[PDB]
Write a protein that binds this ligand. Structure first.
Ligand SMILES: [K+]
Ligand SMILES: [Mg+2]
Ligand SMILES: [Mg+2]
Ligand SMILES: [Mg+2]
Ligand SMILES: [Mg+2]
Ligand SMILES: [Mg+2]
Ligand SMILES: [Mg+2]
Ligand SMILES: [Mg+2]
Ligand SMILES: [Mg+2]
Ligand SMILES: [Mg+2]
Ligand SMILES: [Mg+2]
Ligand SMILES: [Mg+2]
Ligand SMILES: [Mg+2]
Ligand SMILES: [Mg+2]
Ligand SMILES: [Mg+2]
Ligand SMILES: [Mg+2]
Ligand SMILES: [Mg+2]
Ligand SMILES: [Mg+2]
Ligand SMILES: [Mg+2]
Ligand SMILES: [Mg+2]
Ligand SMILES: [Mg+2]
Lengths: 82, 205, 488, 62, 70
RNA sequence: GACACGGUCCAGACUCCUACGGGAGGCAGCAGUGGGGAAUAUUGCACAAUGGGCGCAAGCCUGAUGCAGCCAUGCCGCGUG
RNA sequence: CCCGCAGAAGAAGCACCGGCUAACUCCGUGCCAGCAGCCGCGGUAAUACGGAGGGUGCAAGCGUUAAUCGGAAUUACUGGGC
């Protein structure tokens, strides 16, 4: 199936997760259909902590995709913020 | 690494003062500047074009206390920027923290300023920065810690810097022992003894 | 700000120094006065060279600050970091047997040891020594063996004096075997006590009385007056009295039950080392003191490593090595040189530098001897004569075997018949040996080792001769024929 | 192949193992390889102090 | 420098480019060639002369002629 | 969904076990050994995080992966006043 | 990541110096021993070989070799000739 999962980027002790729509059968950093946004658990308070394109999330879920736990909590938090 | 050896020998080779001493005594009272170092320093050989370009580059590099690779990186960055490369690199070299803090009058020599900096004795914008090669931005504020505010060498520095010529783009208050770097200079505010063309043609081979 | 201070600067001195450099290394005011200072103290010249201790004496005469530097410091720093215990609990004894006959080699232990399956091997000779940390009558005893034949005299030496007690087998029919009487003095000179037994008393043709009377004639005190000798009698097959040799060895162990350190850095010796495919470098070590662990840094001679795995004689892995207990270990960079001392070291980075520094000097010295000889004797070799030279390249299973075979072949050389071994090493017959023997006029000899495909291809293409032997005797016989056939 | 040997005096023998390097000498025709001093059996040249690294000789001990 | 060995001998025959085959006092045949000093001084060597050759430990096969004698 | 790295059958070579009657094997997966070469490492810790398989879930598995050890191999910053 | 302790205290080598190409003088040998990328040094006046003093360039690195492109318009389409 297609799902939205977190892909790790950046450097040691410096994580940067892309939010990715991809087949579950590929690797963590493997092929994917579309990049949707990003999250950074290290960034300082003067910089944006996260960004997601909610419309595409809705579109793909309607198509039939599934959401992981961390991504789901992320959408929950952003919806709380806005 | 740094050059830890004798200092006046550099001036003797280059044939002109490099301000590598405090200034309590005139440079001529310390050394025979006109003669080059070494036993054969009396003679004046021919210097070819490549020789004079190399001498100019070496003069700049010694005056600002920079090693070779760092200078190469500076030149590359200046080439990448817009405008006349000589202006840009002159701005780049003067953007170092050591040159600024010396030029603000908090030290006797660039070596003394660097030794102060490496020992976490200064802040910019209230943030302690010990790295010598840090590059400063306009409207940044430089100050000394209260912990090392008691240093007598800093005190005498505040006085001996007086007899020197003071810059135009800088503002300094001995009352609060701090400074503001209003804006970056162009080529004009610096010495005409620096010929940038030779450096440009040298590296651009 | 100018006082009248005399020269008082610090000066570093090397091991060997001379006047010419000493003139400016100290920078004393009396430029010739300095020169006269040596010429006055002792016989000395313009070009004379003094030593670091004499240099310290000189610096004392001058009175300036003296600094002494010597190259051995690297070993001293490693020694200092070694952990040193101060608690001395009792230790087991170490005993070696010198029986130079298959019966005297084997049967004595065979009876005490669990079974005789070890004697199931072919060769009828102790081709290599074994170690057994057996427990007998509440007594923990380490037994060591001996080949005691041909050139294995040096192999016996390595074990001649490392042990604590010496046990041996006497043959009444033979009196005292030649090789045996060669081996005897290694312990009498070692001053270590000697206990002897009369074995193979199963056959009723023996002269025990003649033997015990000859005990004085051997050159050793008879026990009748409380001498070094022992009139204990054992039997190889019947085995009556072996339990009494057990009592005697226990008694002597109680006589010399010294206490050794039981916690910390472990120091020991390498008795035997060989090569195996999965194992690689195998180090069989007797650990007189300390306790080995996994991860501990080990240094033996100019080879080093970390003990990746430690095992027993049964092939079973153990967590540690007890003191006075043999153990087979892995983790070394190569073949540990035979008999070299083995120590655990503290830190990691310094061991590599120590080993490489040891290797450099050894290489320097060996090249120095070889080229000294070559340069001195090239023009002396201008004359020629009648000589029969045979070149051999040797591969053997264990280090001691290489030593023994090379020793035998080199002692077999004669003024007109010379056996000049090109070069030998432990392990399989590989392409280096194949192309080496193919290059020169030599032969590949495999003693209890085999060839490999890489060398095999070059050999079949080359028609090089590979000679296979498993017994030392037949090898000597065939090589003797080989050299003797060259004559005339 | 043929290899020129640098330095004053050499320690080679009819059975010597050495390490070779690139570079050629004009005078001797066809010699296309120098020989690396200070490697394997080839020792360094005795008693010289300038350009030590080229011939592979240690630092003079103080 | 290092000391070289000196020996006396005779020229058997001449080869092109001032190279010669030479028999020494000990009876070994060695190829020899002319020193530069002779190439300045226009001294000439032909078969039958008595000459001095120095040799080197590194190579005894080749030697050098350094003095011509009557 | 394969004509299937850690599945099956046949043939070949090679290695190993045997009562000789017959049997077993496939590191170009992670460490590691031998050999070749001028030349290239630790038989390490943990599923705390990402991702994957199974389950309702708790949870289990993961030498992927996260982190560590060795190496002046390189880029880069600092000191030896 | 921060604070305290003591002490200049625990820490600089490599290559080059005849022209190309930045930087010279003496001693030791005497077309020898040797250097060398090329031209080429060395036969008793060697800034070119070895040692020393001085100098030049890099720097926790410095050199040699291996290899690709550039210099080469020396495969020339841009850009060569008979
Ligand atoms: K220091
Ligand atoms: Mg893939
Ligand atoms: Mg650097
Ligand atoms: Mg290892
Ligand atoms: Mg397929
Ligand atoms: Mg597999
Ligand atoms: Mg099978
Ligand atoms: Mg592998
Ligand atoms: Mg190899
Ligand atoms: Mg998970
Ligand atoms: Mg499992
Ligand atoms: Mg590093
Ligand atoms: Mg010049
Ligand atoms: Mg040179
Ligand atoms: Mg010409
Ligand atoms: Mg001269
Ligand atoms: Mg010289
Ligand atoms: Mg010098
Ligand atoms: Mg071009
Ligand atoms: Mg082209
Ligand atoms: Mg043309």
């Amino acid at each position: 199936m297609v799902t939205i999962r977190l892909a790790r980027h950046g450097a040691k002790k410096r994580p940067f997760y892309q939010v990715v729509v991809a087949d579950s059968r590929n690797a963590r950093n493997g092929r994917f259909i579309e990049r949707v946004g990003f999250f950074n658990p290290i960034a300082s308070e003067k910089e944006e902590g996260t960004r997601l394109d909610l419309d595409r999330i809705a579109h793909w879920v309607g198509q039939g995709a599934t959401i992981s736990d961390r991504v789901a909590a992320l959408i929950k938090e952003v919806n709380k913020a806005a | 690494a740094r050059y830890l050896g004798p200092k006046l020998k550099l001036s003797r080779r280059e044939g002109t003062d490099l301000f590598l001493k405090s200034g309590v005594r005139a440079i001529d009272t310390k050394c025979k500047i006109e003669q080059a170092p070494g036993q054969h320093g009396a003679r004046k050989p021919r210097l070819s074009d490549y020789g004079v370009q190399l001498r100019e580059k070496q003069k700049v590099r010694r005056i600002y206390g920079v090693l070779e690779r760092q200078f190469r990186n500076y030149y590359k960055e200046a080439a990448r920027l817009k405008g006349n490369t000589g202006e840009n690199l002159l701005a780049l070299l003067e953007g170092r923290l050591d040159n600024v803090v010396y030029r603000m009058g908090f030290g006797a020599t660039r070596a003394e300023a660097r030794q102060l900096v490496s020992h976490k004795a200064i802040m910019v914008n209230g943030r302690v920065v010990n790295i010598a090669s840090y590059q400063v931005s306009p409207n940044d504020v430089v100050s000394i810690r209260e912990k090392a505010k008691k240093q007598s060498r800093v005190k005498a520095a505040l006085e001996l810097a007086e007899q020197r010529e003071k810059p135009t783009w800088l503002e300094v208050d001995a009352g609060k022992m701090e400074g503001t770097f209003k804006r970056k200079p162009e080529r004009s505010d610096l010495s005409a003894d620096i010929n940038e063309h030779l450096i440009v043609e040298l590296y651009s081979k | 700000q100018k006082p009248a201070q005399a020269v008082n600067r610090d000066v570093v001195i090397g091991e060997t120094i001379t006047v010419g450099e000493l003139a400016n290394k100290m920078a004393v005011k009396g430029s010739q006065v300095i020169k006269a200072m040596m010429k006055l103290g002792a016989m000395a010249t313009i070009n004379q060279v003094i030593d670091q201790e004499t240099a310290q004496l000189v610096a004392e005469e001058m009175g300036h600050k003296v600094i002494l530097r010597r190259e051995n410091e690297l070993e001293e720093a490693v020694m200092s970091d070694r952990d040193t215990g101060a608690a001395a609990e009792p230790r087991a004894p170490v005993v070696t047997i010198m029986g130079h006959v298959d019966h005297g080699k084997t049967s004595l232990l065979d009876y005490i040891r669990s079974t005789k399956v070890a004697s199931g091997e072919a060769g009828g000779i102790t081709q290599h020594i074994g170690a057994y940390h057996v427990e007998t009558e509440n007594g923990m005893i380490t037994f060591l063996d001996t080949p005691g034949h041909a050139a294995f005299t040096s192999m016996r030496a390595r074990g001649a004096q490392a042990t604590d007690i010496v046990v041996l087998v006497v043959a009444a029919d033979d009196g005292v075997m030649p090789q045996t009487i060669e081996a005897i003095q290694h312990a009498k000179a070692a001053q270590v006590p000697v206990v002897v037994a009369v074995n193979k008393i199963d056959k009723p043709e023996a002269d025990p009385d003649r033997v015990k009377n000859e005990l004085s004639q051997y050159g050793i005190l008879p026990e009748e007056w409380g001498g070094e000798s022992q009139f204990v009698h054992v039997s190889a097959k019947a085995g009556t009295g072996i339990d009494e040799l057990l009592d005697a060895i226990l008694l002597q162990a109680e006589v010399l039950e010294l206490k050794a350190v039981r916690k910390g850095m472990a120091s020991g010796a390498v008795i035997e080392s060989f090569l195996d495919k999965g194992r690689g470098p195998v180090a069989t070590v007797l650990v007189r003191e300390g306790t080995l662990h996994k991860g501990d840094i080990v240094l033996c001679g100019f080879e080093y490593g970390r003990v990746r795995a430690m095992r027993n004689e049964l092939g079973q892995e153990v967590l540690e090595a007890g003191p006075s207990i043999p153990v087979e270990i892995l983790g070394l960079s190569g073949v540990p040189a035979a008999g070299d001392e083995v120590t655990v070291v503290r830190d990691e980075k310094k061991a590599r530098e120590v080993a490489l520094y040891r290797q450099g000097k050894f290489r320097e010295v060996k090249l120095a001897r070889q080229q000294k000889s070559k340069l001195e004797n090239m023009f002396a070799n201008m004359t020629e004569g009648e000589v029969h030279e045979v070149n051999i390249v040797l591969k053997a299973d264990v280090q001691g075997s290489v030593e023994a075979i090379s020793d035998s072949l080199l002692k077999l050389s004669t003024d007109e018949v010379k056996v000049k071994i090109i070069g030998s090493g432990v392990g399989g017959i590989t392409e280096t040996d194949a192309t080496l023997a193919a290059a020169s006029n030599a032969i590949l000899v495999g003693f209890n080792v085999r060839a490999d495909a890489s060398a095999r291809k070059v050999i079949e293409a080359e028609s090089l001769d590979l000679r296979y032997y498993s017994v030392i005797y037949n090898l000597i016989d065939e090589v003797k024929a080989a050299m003797s056939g060259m004559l005339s | 192949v043929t290899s020129y040997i640098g330095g004053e005096g050499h320690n080679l023998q009819e059975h010597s193992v050495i390490l070779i390097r690139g570079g050629r000498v004009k005078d001797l025709p066809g010699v296309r390889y120098h020989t690396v001093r200070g490697a394997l059996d080839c020792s360094g040249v005795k008693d010289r102090k300038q350009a030590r690294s080229k011939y592979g000789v240690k630092r003079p001990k103080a | 420098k290092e000391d070289n060995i000196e020996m006396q001998g005779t020229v058997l025959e001449t080869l092109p480019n001032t190279m010669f085959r030479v028999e020494l006092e000990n009876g070994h045949v060695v190829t020899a060639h002319i020193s530069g000093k002779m190439r300045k001084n226009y001294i000439r060597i032909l078969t039958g002369d008595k000459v001095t050759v120095e040799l080197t430990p590194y190579d005894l096969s080749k030697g050098r002629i350094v003095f011509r004698s009557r």
